[PDB]
Design a protein around this ligand. Structure first.
Ligand code: ZN
Length: 304
């Protein structure tokens, strides 16, 4: 029998975990018991980068990773988290699987990083909560928008006309409550997790950054497996991914609905001038990441 480990940063109550449970179920049934995958949630084995390294050395069998996270190896890969570059999840898939940039990055993942990409999932979009309504981009002006201390997030707050306000995540509730800070952005699960709906009366569907999740196997594991058991593992991660995606899609819907119950009001501002405002940031991406950057941007922009 094959005794396989699967690590991930997410927790037992997460969509990522519920879905890896499925993947593990199916690999056990359909390998007629030969393979069995244990779960190591909550960064138990290290952070993402350590788990990625462990996939390369073969000491961890599976792990999760966003596609933007690969910019640690290839800087042009941060294209995936550039604000308004990935309009939707259909863009994230065609970007990864149906472009020369993305086809090639999967080939790099393998050749350089010892990692086989089995499947991709949707892991949620970042949206914007505030003490007052965002009906358009003209509302962004004046807002103390809390972002984490990450270039793409600050570039979002900055270029839309907001006032970016990095602060520690645990300080964010009271900052919002006492209106020291006006809004924040983050996936909807954080809004709920951190109770921001209590201190934020408005939620804007700003669709500004989108997160994905890759089902990754160690090359040392995958190719030591027999051809039939490889396909069992691959099929199961394509099934698990479709589920994972549907968990996030369906749960985002229910969370909008939940928030409305809490007295939050939702807006759907026009995002054409939001993405127009980013062109200065894109210029700076292509400057830093050069020719590889420019074609990634242009090939992904060329999508739907
Ligand atoms: Zn065993």
């Amino acid at each position: 029998d094959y005794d396989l480990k699967f690590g991930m940063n997410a927790g037992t109550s997460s969509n990522e975990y519920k879905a890896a449970e499925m993947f593990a179920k199916e690999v056990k049934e359909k390998s007629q018991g030969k393979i069995e995958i244990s779960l190591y949630p909550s960064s138990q084995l290290g952070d993402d980068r350590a788990m990625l390294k462990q996939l390369k050395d073969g000491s961890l069998d599976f792990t999760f990773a966003e596609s933007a996270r690969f910019q640690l190896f290839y800087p042009e890969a941060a294209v995936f988290a550039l604000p308004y570059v990935i309009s939707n999840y259909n863009v994230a898939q065609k970007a990864l699987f149906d472009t020369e940039f993305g086809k090639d990055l999967i080939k790099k993942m393998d050749k350089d990083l010892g990692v086989t990409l089995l499947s991709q999932a949707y892991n949620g979009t970042r949206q914007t909560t505030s003490n007052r309504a965002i009906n358009s981009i003209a509302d962004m002006k004046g807002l103390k928008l809390r972002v984490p201390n990450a270039a793409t997030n600050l570039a979002y707050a900055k270029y839309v006309g907001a006032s970016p306000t990095p602060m520690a995540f645990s300080e964010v509730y009271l900052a919002l409550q006492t209106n020291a800070v006006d809004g924040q952005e983050n996936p909807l699960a954080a809004v709920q997790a951190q109770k921001f709906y209590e201190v934020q009366k408005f939620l804007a569907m700003t669709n500004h950054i989108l997160n994905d999740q890759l089902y990754l196997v160690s090359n040392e594991t995958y190719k030591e497996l027999p051809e039939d058991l490889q396909k069992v593992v691959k099929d199961a991660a394509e099934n698990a991914a479709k589920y994972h995606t549907k968990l996030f899609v369906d749960g985002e819907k229910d969370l909008v609905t939940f928030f409305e119950k809490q007295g939050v009001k939702i807006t759907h501002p026009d995002l054409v001038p939001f993405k127009e405002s980013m062109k200065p940031y894109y210029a700076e991406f292509v400057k830093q990441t050069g020719q590889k950057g420019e074609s990634a941007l242009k090939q992904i922009e060329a999508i739907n």
